[PDB]
Amino acid sequence: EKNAVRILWGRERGARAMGAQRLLQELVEDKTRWMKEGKRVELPDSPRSTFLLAFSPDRTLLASTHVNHNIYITEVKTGKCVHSLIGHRRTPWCVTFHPTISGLIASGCLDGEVRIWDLHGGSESWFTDSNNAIASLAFHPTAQLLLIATANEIHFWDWSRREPFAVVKTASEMERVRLVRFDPLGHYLLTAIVNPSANTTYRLQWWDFTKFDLPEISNASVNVLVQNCKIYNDASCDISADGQLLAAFIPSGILAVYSLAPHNLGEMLYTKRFGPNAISVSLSPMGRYVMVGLASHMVAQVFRLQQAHGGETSMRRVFNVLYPMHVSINSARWLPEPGLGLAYGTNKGDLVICRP
Amino acid sequence: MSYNYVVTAQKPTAVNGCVTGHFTSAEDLNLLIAKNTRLEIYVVTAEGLRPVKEVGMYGKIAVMELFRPKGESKDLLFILTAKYNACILEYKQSGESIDIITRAHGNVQDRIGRPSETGIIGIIDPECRMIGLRLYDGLFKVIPLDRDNKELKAFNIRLEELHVIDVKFLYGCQAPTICFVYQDPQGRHVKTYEVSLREKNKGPWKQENVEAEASMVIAVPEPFGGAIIIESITYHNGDKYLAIAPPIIKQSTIVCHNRVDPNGSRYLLGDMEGRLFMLLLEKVTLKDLRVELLTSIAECLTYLDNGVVFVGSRLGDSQLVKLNVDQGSYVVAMETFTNLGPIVDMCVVDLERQGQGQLVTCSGAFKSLRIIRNGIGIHEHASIDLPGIKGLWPLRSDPNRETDDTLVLSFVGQTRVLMLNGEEVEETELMGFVDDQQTFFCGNVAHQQLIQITSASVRLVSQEPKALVSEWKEPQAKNISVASCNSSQVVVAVGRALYYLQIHPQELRQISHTEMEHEVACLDITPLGDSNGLSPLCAIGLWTDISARILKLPSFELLHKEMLGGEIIPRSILMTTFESSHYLLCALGDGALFYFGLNIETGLLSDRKKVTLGTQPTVLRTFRSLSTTNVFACSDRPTVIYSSNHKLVFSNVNLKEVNYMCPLNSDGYPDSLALANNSTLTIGTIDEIQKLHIRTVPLYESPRKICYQEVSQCFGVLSSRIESSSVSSSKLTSFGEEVEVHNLLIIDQHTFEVLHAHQFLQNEYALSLVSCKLGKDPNTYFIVGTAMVPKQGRIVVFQYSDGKLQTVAEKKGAVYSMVEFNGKLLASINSTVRLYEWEKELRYNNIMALYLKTKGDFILVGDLMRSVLLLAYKPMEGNFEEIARDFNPNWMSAVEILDDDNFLGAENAFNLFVCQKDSAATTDEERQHLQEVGLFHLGEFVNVFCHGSLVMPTQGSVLFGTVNGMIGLVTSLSESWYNLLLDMQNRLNKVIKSVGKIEHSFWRSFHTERKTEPATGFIDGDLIESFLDISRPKMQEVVANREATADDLIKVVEELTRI
């Protein structure tokens, strides 16, 4: 029965026929696709733009970067701006929360400065040797580590020490390291590197960091999963909470879903065609619905996976999410728990949390 | 200003794990039941199951398996708390005091893991070289079992099979070998790996394909080698292949499995339909497989020994079946536990229209009503169909050798003496009294003599001579109205005059004679202290003035008196000592009971309180159930006057009507007590005053709700089966669909026999039932909601009649829930609230509901979508208004309202939170947010909330049933008492931290996987109730640093245990 009751009757009756909780959250996502608001939040200052939302793993707070060279921290429930991280002389480019240690957040700016912040008190800062622009950041969930990529150099630094330990560089200077990210399990590492020559093409290499071996990313033909992918920021690709799903742009922007399970790793499950305005993607916690922010009302869209064959009809359009006002979506992401809603940032300098 | 108090009355009883081992000792096999939050340690014997230590550990058990490490004398136990608080437990066996010493502890929780779909399981290497826990998908956490690593420093190993159904370790291999079936999207497969410690591989056989409906794994032991995957039971070991496809198995699925013998020639498989299968194997390489058919539903089977199989049921009453080798079936039940499991709902009913209430539950499912009360129950032994008796008192017709062998029954004008030569009840009169005269006392005093105090004359008959020795009568030819004689003195009252007689050797001698202002109503002389039969004081009552006075027995001189209102004469008065302070009981003829303290030296007028009782006259009597004697009240509402620390309780009794009572100590009835009524004779023992008694009545169906009927005196229960009477006539489909057959069983409240069954349509899930008085019609209804899943919905107004159910009206989609508000039904479902009313018919915001509850007030609490919603009904507007909606969404399970401010609540993560309108600003811009003024983690799946209480400084109460069968109470209280007690709330941490070295605040935290916040104002009642269990030498140093008295707080807290 497609009811909350019978599934729950089996649950409350102590019959541990698991998978029901999965199905129940499948239903509420289906249920929440029908319900309809735009709630704003005040800010201590008036930044021109809002960039790079990043949700907490404990959902206690929410960091965000703004052009005012400050980072605002807001609580999701109250919607009240509590903390405003200040200290970057330049606008930060990458902000990532810490899965294990609560309140320890890092942020790196275009001037080559990284700043590890703590809400309770204290902070650390390190300087790149040639103050180059920072590309992407990726915290290590289990191991005490944060990887730093600036142009083509991967910096292996432990914040318990002042200076990075290991230095690994690509085959060429122009072979830039654009994006780095661990998976929600910390077993595999995805490295985005520009292809040798806008039509700037990038490739994804799939390094196993289980043994913490330094990835020899100079080779462009080892552990490659995607030959060509369009990447502009760190939010253009993301991994589902379960870790068995992945979304990434491909050129003719075509969003395609690739199974991360080893049995059919790299196999293309679901696909749809999108215009150039597609920027960032985000997967629902149970790997069924995808949120995508769009550039210029219809600013966002949600889809649902029905059958995996690689064709266009893999998903079906569900509905649209609007904002109570050109406006182009910079960042968006599904809230950690399914069905709560979504938060996003605005190029005009707005942070709005939408709920049904 | 609003601070709660959570306490549990009945602990959970659903079974979750039955792993067997040698935890208690190497030479004593145990069974290790694991309830939701407490593990019961039993020892299995020939008789059955015997609890040895019922340790309630502060955690929710999820993974639990006994293993034997190398160099360990006894097998350890690995409890994995549902919050990943992994601990290697070890039973500490020292002496009378037994605790659970933690060998190693540590939160193995993973900040990035996601629990696997098919639950959480853990396995141990056969050679104890490794511990393997399957917490997250594709994350096989491995804990080495070296003598080091007391902090349980675990590490993660990736698995290729992301989705794993069941995993075990194959026997008979050098390296750690693992066998498991996964669900890659090509049927179902099996794989093998060699787990490497240092490296952190390949197995004996490669990956093959098996049936897509095979999920369970049975790894055979060393002599055979290999694994059995479970209408297809295969076997796999290297290249050898076997498979069978029996037709019987195709009917349903199999859920239980475990090895039977070390040889591997027999196995157990449990079906979902209560069928006990029996797997066989023929003997190296085997030849072929075979299946056999030989019970209630089983959740985890555990073959104990010699054909004893424990059928652990999370769906119903867990059984203890026997498998006999010799209808020709081999499934016979020996034991059936009273485990209330899926408590789907309940309601509070006062069947006898007395102060106490009752609970009727709907336990079990598929293949349901049980009665929950709070009074002390009595198990009847012998029944005699005798007429009304004017009194009851045991008689010792034998010499001073303890016990008794004779019973004295007093009629209206006759006295029938009964002899009990064991279990027989024969009326035999002794030649020492008069059988044609009413006797007020037929007991024994001393000198082997039985005092026969009758209305005509007091008689004293020796037990040995079996004849009257002396007879004392008033020298006025007047009938004796009130008499009293305990062990050595007689205080009888005739008219307005009273005479005192001494129980001398074979002679009666008058000692005092005095007259009172009014006629004496009752006389009671009993030692309340250091007195061996000779009562110093003597109580006397008045009818014209209705007053109670205390006088010295030897001289009949009044000492003090207390005035009383009204004109009802006191039915009975008694004074006795049951605690450090003696108490005096005064009972009126209408049933009013006055309890006041008494002093053995002076007898000053202490504090007096009015305690309600039955409408019939009450005769006070003491009972010996435990070491501390209690008093019992016989009236239309019988009650037992027990105590907890220093105050007298008034717990009810399990009987219809009581006219007289008398203790019994005969050889055939050691702890029985005589009971009298209009025409009845029952016996009972009673041990406590807090046990809950359960009466069962199976229905073999799946119920949804229940409501009581006050004018027809019969319950109603929904039925939904899968395959007097009535059939629906709804005049307003593939072969294989989802259709259920529904009924409505009307259970009589007297005979517990169903009287009707209203069969409904096919493919229509009706799961609602409400009893109310809709509109101005005096007729009382059985309103039942019917839902099909949804473009239609109808409601049958089951207007009950003499023998036939009727319908008044029928009235777009499936309605969700509604109970009567005041006299109407205006439901809130399908994203549209209603304004309905009762022509005998039942004749917009996007408001849809899942659970709904309200007190008699206009205040209403509901839920739109995963949020506690508070709604107010404005009579001027006649609709619903959203007052304050709780944010921070939680997956709610049951909702209740404590008072106008505090809103109790629960959610599926086993947590309780209370909302309250704390003062705020901005007129109405943040008041719509209900700031959580409390956070508490209970550990149970609260299912139904209901008001009422099982007893007659909070104002209100609440009960909640769980999915595991736990009942409890929640109160509220101001900040003044809370804040003062807040400082000493954590005082108990020092004397004891936890059972598995767990932080106190960690249980005070909000254990949801996202948040963690210490309890805010939720005062526990479980920990404080354990304050009285702390030993006296240990109780001294706690709360020791205004008078700072040792027992000052105990009195302040002993009032909490009476809630």
Side-chain angles (χ1 to χ4, degrees), chain A residues 3-4 6-7 9-36 38-47 49-58 60-161 163-172 174-175 177-356, chain B residues 1-26 28-29 31-46 48-57 59-64 66-69 71 73 76-91 93-95 97-110 112-113 115-126 128-135 138 140-145 149 152 154-160 163-169 171-183 185 187 189-199 201 203-205 207-210 212 214-221 223-230 232-238 240-249 252-270 272 274-281 283-284 286 289-313 315-337 340-345 347-352 354-355 357-373 375 377 382 387-388 391 394 399 413 422 432 443 446 456 465 467 475 477 483 493 495 497 505 521 527 529 533 536 539 541 548 554 565-566 570 587 589 591-592 597 603 614 617 633 638 663 668 670 674 676 684 691-694 696-703 705-729 732-738 741-750 754-758 760-761 765-766 768-773 775-776 778-790 792-797 799-801 803 805 807 809 811 813-828 832-833 836-838 840 842 845 847 849-857 859-862 864-873 875 878-880 883-887 889-900 903-915 917 919-922 929-931 933-954 956-962 964-973 977-978 986-989 991-992 994-998 1000 1002-1008 1011-1021 1024 1026-1028 1030 1033 1036-1040 1042-1044 1046-1050 1053 1055-1059:
Chain A
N3 55 359
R6 180 182 290 176
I7 322 295
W9 290 97
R11 297 296 86 193
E12 51 76 20
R13 286 158 171 186
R16 267 80 70 192
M18 295 298 102
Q21 182 54 221
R22 164 60 198 260
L23 281 164
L24 272 186
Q25 311 205 354
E26 289 204 24
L27 176 54
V28 302
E29 293 179 353
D30 274 322
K31 295 307 298 179
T32 44
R33 92 198 177 222
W34 295 116
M35 261 285 178
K36 175 74 213 61
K39 182 175 74 68
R40 294 180 185 270
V41 55
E42 82 277 14
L43 295 177
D45 315 289
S46 165
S49 180
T50 308
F51 285 163
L52 198 44
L53 283 72
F55 292 166
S56 304
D58 56 2
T60 65
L61 291 92
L62 169 61
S64 281
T65 62
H66 300 78
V67 76
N68 72 337
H69 302 205
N70 300 341
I71 297 89
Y72 300 140
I73 322 295
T74 308
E75 202 187 357
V76 182
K77 302 164 192 169
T78 77
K80 295 332 310 183
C81 187
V82 190
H83 286 66
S84 302
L85 308 180
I86 308 180
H88 277 282
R89 281 82 65 193
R90 202 76 182 102
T91 293
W93 193 245
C94 307
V95 55
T96 61
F97 268 82
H98 205 273
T100 64
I101 286 172
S102 42
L104 203 60
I105 306 166
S107 65
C109 50
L110 273 298
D111 279 6
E113 179 188 22
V114 298
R115 279 209 176 208
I116 294 171
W117 287 106
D118 211 43
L119 172 142
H120 302 47
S123 68
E124 299 194 337
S125 63
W126 182 80
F127 279 65
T128 45
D129 308 298
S130 64
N131 77 359
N132 296 115
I134 308 299
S136 279
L137 277 296
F139 264 90
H140 192 318
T142 54
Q144 189 183 0
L145 182 62
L146 166 76
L147 280 300
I148 304 98
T150 74
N152 71 333
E153 173 51 46
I154 294 285
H155 303 79
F156 165 72
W157 176 45
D158 185 358
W159 47 83
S160 73
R161 311 310 159 230
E163 193 68 26
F165 192 26
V167 171
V168 298
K169 179 254 162 164
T170 58
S172 169
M174 60 67 78
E175 279 214 323
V177 185
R178 191 66 183 96
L179 188 153
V180 293
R181 190 176 260 130
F182 278 123
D183 55 55
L185 291 175
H187 284 161
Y188 293 149
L189 178 75
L190 184 70
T191 61
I193 297 89
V194 60
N195 293 319
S197 179
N199 290 341
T200 311
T201 59
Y202 304 72
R203 59 181 182 267
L204 301 183
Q205 278 155 259
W206 192 277
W207 183 257
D208 201 345
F209 205 68
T210 304
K211 302 310 298 169
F212 310 94
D213 297 303
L214 300 191
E216 186 212 315
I217 76 175
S218 64
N219 200 327
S221 69
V222 173
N223 301 359
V224 181
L225 215 56
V226 176
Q227 295 297 109
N228 287 272
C229 65
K230 299 178 178 178
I231 294 172
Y232 163 88
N233 196 358
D234 63 358
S236 303
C237 68
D238 186 74
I239 309 174
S240 67
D242 55 77
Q244 321 171 338
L245 277 296
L246 192 148
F249 295 68
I250 57 182
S252 188
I254 297 97
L255 294 174
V257 171
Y258 306 84
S259 196
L260 303 185
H263 78 265
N264 66 337
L265 181 49
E267 166 268 340
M268 182 179 72
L269 286 166
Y270 310 84
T271 58
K272 303 222 151 173
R273 310 302 167 268
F274 291 76
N277 311 277
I279 305 143
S280 51
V281 298
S282 306
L283 274 71
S284 77
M286 321 276 268
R288 314 161 75 236
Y289 291 62
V290 298
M291 171 35 78
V292 174
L294 294 175
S296 190
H297 292 104
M298 211 275 278
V299 291
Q301 268 206 48
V302 181
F303 310 86
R304 190 266 186 277
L305 321 173
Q306 304 146 109
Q307 73 303 340
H309 50 84
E312 167 156 28
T313 185
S314 296
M315 282 136 278
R316 54 82 181 181
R317 198 174 84 93
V318 191
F319 67 91
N320 305 341
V321 176
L322 78 164
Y323 153 76
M325 321 199 192
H326 85 96
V327 173
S328 291
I329 301 299
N330 306 154
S331 168
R333 174 161 290 81
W334 289 104
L335 297 176
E337 199 64 18
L340 321 174
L342 60 84
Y344 59 100
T346 300
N347 56 316
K348 287 190 180 173
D350 293 331
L351 170 60
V352 183
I353 297 187
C354 279
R355 286 183 270 194
Chain B
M1 61 79 71
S2 67
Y3 294 122
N4 301 136
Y5 170 94
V6 290
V7 63
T8 81
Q10 173 85 59
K11 300 156 284 189
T13 182
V15 164
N16 283 359
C18 295
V19 298
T20 186
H22 282 271
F23 190 51
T24 62
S25 72
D28 300 301
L29 73 165
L31 188 153
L32 276 295
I33 306 99
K35 315 288 181 70
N36 189 358
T37 319
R38 311 180 70 266
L39 73 165
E40 294 181 353
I41 313 313
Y42 287 23
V43 171
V44 65
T45 56
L49 265 55
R50 202 269 326 281
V52 292
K53 189 71 169 67
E54 182 204 321
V55 160
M57 61 79 71
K60 180 179 180 292
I61 314 172
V63 170
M64 151 166 162
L66 276 76
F67 63 94
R68 173 86 48 76
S73 60
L76 306 190
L77 166 60
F78 183 73
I79 301 299
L80 183 63
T81 304
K83 299 289 95 175
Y84 310 133
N85 194 355
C87 295
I88 298 177
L89 279 299
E90 193 205 348
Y91 203 66
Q93 191 265 334
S94 75
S97 80
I98 293 304
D99 54 354
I100 319 298
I101 50 176
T102 286
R103 278 281 189 94
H105 67 87
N107 201 350
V108 302
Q109 99 288 9
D110 187 69
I112 62 170
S116 83
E117 294 297 329
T118 185
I120 301 299
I121 65 174
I123 57 174
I124 314 293
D125 184 283
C128 84
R129 292 181 319 255
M130 181 169 328
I131 298 105
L133 311 187
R134 211 274 312 278
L135 280 44
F140 186 61
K141 180 161 280 290
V142 164
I143 296 90
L145 183 63
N149 197 6
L152 296 185
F155 62 93
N156 218 48
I157 300 176
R158 188 195 63 85
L159 289 202
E160 288 79 0
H163 193 294
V164 168
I165 290 301
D166 207 52
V167 58
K168 289 201 166 166
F169 281 151
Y171 293 98
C173 184
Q174 296 298 109
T177 307
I178 189 168
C179 181
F180 67 98
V181 292
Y182 57 95
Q183 277 281 21
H189 308 262
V190 68
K191 217 161 195 181
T192 318
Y193 284 125
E194 266 184 355
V195 179
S196 66
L197 291 171
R198 279 77 60 197
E199 179 271 337
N201 289 318
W205 61 81
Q207 166 264 309
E208 65 186 359
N209 285 21
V210 287
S215 296
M216 192 55 107
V217 174
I218 297 196
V220 310
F224 292 166
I228 284 177
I229 307 174
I230 304 163
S232 70
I233 304 163
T234 67
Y235 157 83
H236 309 284
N237 187 357
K240 152 178 47 161
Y241 205 104
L242 269 187
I244 61 163
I248 322 173
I249 293 172
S252 186
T253 63
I254 297 94
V255 176
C256 295
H257 88 273
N258 65 338
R259 186 186 311 107
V260 172
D261 293 333
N263 57 25
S265 307
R266 191 168 65 244
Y267 281 105
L268 294 171
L269 285 185
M272 281 196 38
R275 298 277 296 285
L276 196 150
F277 287 75
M278 172 55 108
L279 187 61
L280 277 296
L281 294 174
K283 305 190 180 187
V284 296
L286 73 164
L289 289 81
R290 190 178 66 189
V291 76
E292 294 199 330
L293 275 298
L294 264 66
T295 184
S296 66
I297 308 169
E299 170 83 343
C300 56
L301 268 192
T302 295
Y303 181 88
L304 308 182
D305 197 0
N306 52 60
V308 176
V309 183
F310 180 85
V311 182
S313 175
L315 293 173
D317 45 353
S318 298
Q319 291 185 351
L320 196 149
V321 306
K322 175 73 66 68
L323 260 55
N324 287 317
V325 61
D326 46 57
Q327 208 262 355
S329 181
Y330 320 102
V331 174
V332 65
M334 300 324 198
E335 184 67 28
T336 297
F337 290 144
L340 310 96
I343 300 173
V344 293
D345 80 321
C347 74
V348 177
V349 190
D350 46 352
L351 277 296
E352 293 84 3
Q354 303 167 357
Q358 300 193 7
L359 291 173
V360 286
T361 65
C362 318
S363 299
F366 297 163
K367 58 148 295 192
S368 73
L369 294 175
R370 290 147 170 273
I371 314 309
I372 301 294
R373 291 184 291 112
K691 74 209 153 181
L692 313 185
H693 262 278
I694 305 96
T696 64
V697 57
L699 306 171
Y700 320 102
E701 56 84 19
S702 171
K705 278 200 282 289
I706 177 174
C707 288
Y708 155 83
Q709 180 52 256
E710 80 287 352
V711 300
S712 172
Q713 281 65 37
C714 55
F715 297 134
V717 173
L718 301 175
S719 175
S720 56
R721 56 157 179 265
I722 285 303
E723 279 296 274
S724 306
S725 171
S726 169
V727 166
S728 177
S729 89
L732 73 165
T733 61
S734 162
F735 150 72
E737 281 185 310
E738 303 163 335
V741 184
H742 301 257
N743 293 110
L744 204 168
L745 310 183
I746 297 285
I747 297 89
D748 188 1
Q749 47 178 63
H750 301 123
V754 55
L755 300 194
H756 201 71
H758 185 71
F760 206 69
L761 283 75
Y765 299 160
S768 292
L769 157 64
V770 175
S771 172
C772 67
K773 279 77 66 180
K776 271 69 58 185
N779 305 346
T780 312
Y781 300 161
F782 279 102
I783 303 197
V784 165
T786 67
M788 41 76 68
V789 186
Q792 189 183 4
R794 64 174 291 166
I795 298 169
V796 60
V797 185
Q799 204 275 355
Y800 204 64
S801 307
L805 194 145
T807 304
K811 190 65 177 177
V815 70
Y816 275 101
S817 179
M818 181 95 178
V819 74
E820 70 91 12
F821 194 30
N822 51 7
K824 300 182 293 296
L825 294 174
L826 72 165
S828 165
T832 294
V833 287
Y836 288 164
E837 58 90 21
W838 173 250
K840 308 310 150 284
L842 289 173
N845 194 347
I847 297 169
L850 322 168
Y851 305 131
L852 183 63
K853 186 64 62 65
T854 178
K855 196 173 75 175
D857 46 25
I859 286 301
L860 168 66
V861 70
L864 173 54
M865 280 294 98
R866 303 274 71 83
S867 61
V868 163
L869 195 55
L870 173 75
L871 296 176
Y873 174 76
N879 55 2
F880 292 128
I883 291 312
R885 154 200 301 286
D886 171 45
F887 284 88
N890 292 318
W891 290 58
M892 317 276 184
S893 166
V895 179
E896 198 44 76
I897 290 171
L898 288 165
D899 65 337
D900 292 331
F903 302 149
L904 187 58
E907 53 94 18
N908 64 5
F910 304 71
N911 295 317
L912 276 70
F913 73 100
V914 162
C915 284
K917 282 80 68 178
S919 46
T922 71
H929 292 46
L930 283 159
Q931 50 269 17
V933 305
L935 286 183
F936 184 98
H937 175 102
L938 183 63
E940 310 295 326
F941 198 67
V942 168
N943 188 21
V944 55
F945 268 116
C946 77
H947 294 285
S949 170
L950 310 188
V951 285
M952 292 65 87
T954 300
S957 290
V958 60
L959 276 299
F960 49 96
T962 58
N964 297 111
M966 183 278 288
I967 209 66
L969 285 75
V970 177
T971 65
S972 45
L973 191 150
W977 183 258
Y978 163 86
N986 302 8
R987 181 60 181 267
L988 282 73
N989 280 181
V991 62
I992 185 65
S994 179
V995 67
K997 293 180 176 66
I998 307 146
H1000 155 94
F1002 182 76
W1003 264 107
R1004 303 319 72 201
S1005 73
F1006 185 57
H1007 303 76
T1008 306
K1011 294 166 40 81
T1012 291
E1013 295 85 2
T1016 51
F1018 266 105
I1019 285 187
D1020 183 8
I1024 297 172
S1026 60
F1027 184 80
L1028 290 75
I1030 292 172
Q1036 280 273 15
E1037 69 275 16
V1038 302
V1039 65
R1042 295 291 182 268
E1043 68 270 16
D1047 298 334
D1048 174 35
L1049 194 62
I1050 300 177
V1053 175
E1055 59 87 20
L1056 275 152
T1057 190
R1058 274 179 291 269
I1059 295 166

